[PDB]
Amino acid sequence: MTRFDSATEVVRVGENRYAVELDPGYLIGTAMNGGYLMTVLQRSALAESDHLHAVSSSYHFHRPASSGPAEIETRVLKRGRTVTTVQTTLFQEGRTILTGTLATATLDPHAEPRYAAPQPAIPPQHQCRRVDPRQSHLPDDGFLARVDVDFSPDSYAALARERTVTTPELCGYVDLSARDGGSAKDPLAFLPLAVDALPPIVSLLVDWSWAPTVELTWHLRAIPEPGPLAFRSTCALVSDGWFDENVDLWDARGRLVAQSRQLARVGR
């Protein structure tokens, strides 16, 4: 087992009802990381579905969650031969935290694209640079110790402020941490965390290092084989406190597997 496998398990407690334990190791401060809460909700949805994969998932974040127990309430909105859509909502201390709606279907793992834009040039993982997480009061050194994130030299330079930031862009490789048990066993389970496992892109543009997510929708495009994911994060506009963070993930083979866009407002 990897820490993630244990941390993200959801137990069926009743019909359309699940129980989960939020692992404080995924705290980014006083709130749980959003991607971790997505991972748990994704599990609830596929448990209720006749299809294997979460092909489009839209999540609306209402309030921060903390460690300990949380409860999940699911609802199938539409069942179909190709697409089955499930609504899943997370509760904690009598309050709604987050709601997701997921279009589930079963993708062909050997499907050949009819068209595919090339993966943008990203340096090999060995030429990339990682920042060793220092110790933290957060349980087991909090969120930053749950994932290994390798940045291209330019991305590192950007985050470390040792270079000019003309256009906001980060890239490199991401995976579950070596510390917690190595690469994800089930990549698909990890994608919802992966899309939200990187430094907020806004940190490169205004002087806020984070924002609570308001909305994130992400799409599964191909079935990835296990291993670290190549990532690229961009932003087209910061205005009236609002910013867009666009994260794409590719696999070892250069196959686009995830396209994510979240919207968040600074100072909330």
**Residue carrying the six token digits 């294997």:** 52
170 is written with which tokens? 């980060």
Question: From the list 79, 129, 179, 255, which residue makes contact with Cl ion (rule: CB under 5 A)?
Answer: 79
83 lies in the site for a second copy, by CB under 8 A: yes
| Residue 115, contacted partner among Cl ion, a second copy, none, CB below 5-8 A by kind | a second copy
Question: Taking the complex as a whole, how short is the minimal distance between the CB of residue 9 and a second copy, in angstroms?
Answer: 26
Instruction: Give the Cβ contact number of residue 169 at 10 Å.
Output: 18
29 lies in the site for Cl ion, by CB under 5 A: yes
DSSP 200: -
Question: From the list 114, 126, 134, 161, which residue makes contact with a second copy (rule: CB under 8 A)?
Answer: 114
Question: From the list 7, 10, 20, 31, which residue makes contact with Cl ion (rule: CB under 5 A)?
Answer: 31
Question: From the list 124, 163, 206, 253, which residue makes contact with a second copy (rule: CB under 8 A)?
Answer: 206
Question: Taking the complex as a whole, how short is the minimal distance between the CB of residue 37 and a second copy, in angstroms?
Answer: 15
60 lies in the site for a second copy, by CB under 8 A: yes
Closer by beta carbon to a second copy, 181 or else 212: 212
121 lies in the site for a second copy, by CB under 8 A: no
Find, among 116, 58, 59, 52, the residue nearest to 82 by Cα: 52
C-alpha 259/C-alpha 214 separation (Å) is: 17
107 lies in the site for a second copy, by CB under 8 A: yes
Instruction: Name, in order, each residue with C-beta under 8 angstroms of 214's C-beta and a sequence gap of 6 or more.
Output: 60, 61, 262, 263, 264, 265
Q: Is 177 helix (H, G, I), strand (E, B) or coil?
A: coil
197 lies in the site for Cl ion, by CB under 5 A: no
The phi, psi pair for 266, rounded to 5°, reads: -45, 150
